[PDB]
């Protein structure tokens, strides 16, 4: 893992409009990312 050549990897959590929460890492500097539609929210994943 090269020292400085890489974008800083931020530990973050996913919060969705259905109340579902996910824990991961990402590039988002805020450290917390929101979303309007998720896999649970998305009708296609639910067969709708």
């Amino acid at each position: 893992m090269k020292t400085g050549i890489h974008p800083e990897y931020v530990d973050t959590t996913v919060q969705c409009g259905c109340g579902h929460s996910f824990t991961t890492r990402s590039t988002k500097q805020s450290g917390t990312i929101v979303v309007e539609v998720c896999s649970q929210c998305h009708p296609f994943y639910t067969g709708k």
């Binding site: 890489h6 890492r25 590039t27 988002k28 990312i33 998305h42």
Partner: protein, 182 residues
Amino acid sequence: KALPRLKQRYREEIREALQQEFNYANVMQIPGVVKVVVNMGVGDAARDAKLINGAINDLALITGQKPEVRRARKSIAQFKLREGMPIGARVTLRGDRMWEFLDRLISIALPRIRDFRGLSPKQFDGTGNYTFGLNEQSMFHEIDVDSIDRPRGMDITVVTTATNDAEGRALLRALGFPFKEN
């Protein structure tokens, strides 16, 4: 100490599910994922190289490691493409970084595609690996839509230790892939 959930999911539930339905002779034949590689072919860099600088940063924020700029190894006159000029960028993912990308794409990103309809299950390679491409980069959360200049798409392909297509389709569909049903 730490554990990605999808790898925690694969180790616990998925690994046994594959074994039960395929009745492997030995444990080590359980198909897992090896790596996920993402590349974007510009092709328009044959005229203006300014697009390449734009393409690099898009992938870096998408994944978490700066692309490896790929020189062109052939000189094709019809493309006005010369030897060695940058034409595409590619990112390889191994270790925990696949799962974080794989989960973030499955749960949040893939539903965010404009008029998302699913992915065809016949996009396999015959050897047990999946490929599928996209048309826009503004779909990702990490890239700000105002900061974009033009939709540049990007291709995702996953490599698994499966041999045949059925084993591969069992792995990805049970992994949460929104496969179309032909």
